[PDB]
Design a protein around this ligand. Structure first.
Ligand code: FZK
Ligand code: FZK
Ligand code: NA
Ligand code: NA
Lengths: 421, 377
């Protein structure tokens, strides 16, 4: 949600900034709803003044021995219309609230203005993509050799976009997630959390997936119970820890990390790049609004540190205005080198949401200067999507015989295995 | 599913064995559908109806299973360890965990409603340490091959292990428009056992031993309103075996020993119960439950269920192996056991390891996973 006062008073300036994202704010409907509210409000003030005067005139008419029936009838009608004016004002505000829940976040002024992914800029890259002495195999070919990466059995169980891992490939995937959580908790100041993987609709509205992106979620319909949704990311469960709260400024920043499965039914056919279920180690920050853009740089560096320690070549992209997620003011995407594709592929998105999610969940902090509750800023970033990191490890660490060399940092988690297959 | 030949040649003995479970075999409806189809063929709708009945029949209990009507007829076969005598008033896991916000039911209820939990900091780390310890133990010492599986399955996998068609109400279903519906797994038994469905294994591939650490999702109305003992979501480290039928009862003893070893290493006193005929799960021929000591309850509470399913799930899945003696593809036997339910192990750890001041001693085997933490709070 954007500042409702800003949307109502400056629709044209808000529309100009949203236009950089290719989003067309319905200024005509906002102005028409505002004109309707003003018209009804002026009528209710005129009515309130009229009714109060007629009610007091009854007392005076009684003192004169006069007929109070014309005054009682005016009071009754005026009161009835005032009740309608209230239902009208609530229905107008209700329509405006529903509209304001469908508006994307305002991009920060430091975001390059662009209409598509071609206006995204490379910020930096680290590491050199290996030049192999043989014909590179993709993760599917590498993993299928001994049945340790199995899409056929997964399809037998669950249909398309699922995977089964076994033996050393299952162990490597677990080693990756453990490595990620251990790193963020030990060196990056994150507090570990285990969360529910099923949430009700208010949590999803809090982070922005609802009301607009319901179709991308798996929903569990329940008889005379609130519906449950499978989390698309731990961002939903973690960010909502602080919903409806007034935090002490001394508690900021609140830094959370969770390793969870992530479920998406969103409308890369071969492999585990795009899945209905995938593990992701998620980093979430609840911060002082004054520090959030600096916090984003640190968040992006925490995700980068995983790729650097795994010696995986990667690139950092600054997303342009036309290529950002709904709730983001600024995003950095990390893309890892994928030998079989001869290109970098997305492995993380690190975003500053500003006060947009905090407004939807009423996540506040008490400002030390004013002593008043103010909205916190929120940030989230993948550190990292675990299945995609597995794809990157298998392909970058492949040897001539189809075996996989175990990354140095993963050897303590691999029970003596240094070479897979 | 039961051997259809047995249901045909011995209906009275099969009905008498099922009666010990409190199940009444509709011998008349089977005898009628057999006499009708024999007349209909002599002169496919009757088959579809018999199949539905056949799929609603629970497994035959093994002869060694104690006969009893309910949980009060369960037999304690052995125990391990001495439940600790505390020199102060014992607190439950809820009071222990809530102290610093590290176990939070309130934030979890705000997110998802009742029967969910949020863990943070050292309690979240302790839960993760428990699941890592369990999967590391079974893979290094007990011969299990690790597996990562889907947590969403379609209806055939659940029918393969027995949750479908009879127990649909206990599952969370994701209704999908113009696609087959998905169900959240109630246990990794579902995904793991179905690995071998519709296959003919080589006898040399046996025993196939799988271990997975997965969340488990259940919506059961039949069954602990306070705490994380009963949850709509809980982690569990599942052990599954696909075996040669001649070895399955010996395999059950080894599987139960694998679950017990987790409790022994964590120094958690427990007891082993042989479930009676009337307290057995639908797909089991024989079950041992492990019940861990819970100091605030002054009793042992279920933490694991280890079962031999015989050829029941193998029949539903058409999971076979080529018998080396006959050359014929024969049904395998399947087994499954919790090694262990992670949330309930965390409950057992917080309560058994609690100190007078409300702090929690870290079990010895978990100290390598706790990043220097030896005392929680
Ligand atoms: N909470 C934020 C930051 O993690 C978020 O979820 N953003 S994201 O870009 O939608 O998702 C975060 C990351 O998840 C991975 N991913 C996505 C879809 C899929 O099928 N498989 C994947 O591995 C992508 O690499 C992506 O950068
Ligand atoms: N696949 C087999 C063997 O694990 C199986 O699922 N059996 S079981 O008994 O249904 O479930 C296995 C175990 O899961 C635990 N449990 C159960 C319900 C709940 O809400 N929370 C729990 O922690 C119980 O300790 C139980 O013994
Ligand atoms: Na993205
Ligand atoms: Na049980």
């Amino acid at each position: 949600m954007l500042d409702p006062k800003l949307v109502r008073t400056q629709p044209q300036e808000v529309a100009a900034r949203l236009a950089t994202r290719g989003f067309q704010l319905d200024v005509a409907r906002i102005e028409a709803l505002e004109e309707q509210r003003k018209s009804v409000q002026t009528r209710t003030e005129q009515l309130q003044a009229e009714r109060n005067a007629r009610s007091k005139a009854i007392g005076q008419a009684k003192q004169r021995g006069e007929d109070i029936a014309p005054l009682l009838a005016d009071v009754d009608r005026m009161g009835s219309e005032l009740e309608e004016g209230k239902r009208q004002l609530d229905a107008i505000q209700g329509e405006l609230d529903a509209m304001l829940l469908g508006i994307p976040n305002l991009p920060h002024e430091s975001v390059p203005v662009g209409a598509d992914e071609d206006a995204n800029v490379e910020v930096r890259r680290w590491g050199t993509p290996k030049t192999f002495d043989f014909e590179v195999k993709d993760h599917v070919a590498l993993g299928e050799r001994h049945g340790w990466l199995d899409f056929e059995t997964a399809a037998k169980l669950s249909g398309a976009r699922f995977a089964l891992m076994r033996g050393p490939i299952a162990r490597l995937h677990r080693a990756l997630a453990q490595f990620m959580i251990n790193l963020h908790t030990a060196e990056h100041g994150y507090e570990e959390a285990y969360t529910p993987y099923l949430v009700q609709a208010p949590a999803l509205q809090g982070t922005g997936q609802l009301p607009k992106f319901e179709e991308d979620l798996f929903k569990i319909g329940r008889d005379g119970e609130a519906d449950l949704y499978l989390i698309p990311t731990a961002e939903v469960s973690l960010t909502n820890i602080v919903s409806g709260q007034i935090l002490d400024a001394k508690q900021l920043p609140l830094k959370f990390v969770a390793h969870t499965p992530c479920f998406r039914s969103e409308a890369d056919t071969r492999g585990m790049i795009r899945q209905h279920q995938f593990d992701k180690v998620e980093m979430v920050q609840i911060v002082d609004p004054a520090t959030s853009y600096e916090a984003l740089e640190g968040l992006t560096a925490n995700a980068e540190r995983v790729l650097q320690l795994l010696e995986l070549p990667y690139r950092v992209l600054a997303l342009c205005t036309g290529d950002m997620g709904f709730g983001s003011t600024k995003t950095y995407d990390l893309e890892v080198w994928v030998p079989s594709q001869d290109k970098y592929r997305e492995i993380s998105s690190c975003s500053n949401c500003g006060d947009f999610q905090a407004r939807r969940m009423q996540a506040r902090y008490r400002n030390p200067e004013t002593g008043k509750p103010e909205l916190v800023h929120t940030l989230n970033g993948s550190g990292l999507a675990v299945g995609r990191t597995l794809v990157a490890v298998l392909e970058n660490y492949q040897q001539a015989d189809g075996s996989i060399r175990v990354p140095e940092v993963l050897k303590p988690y691999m029970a003596g295995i240094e070479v897979i297959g």
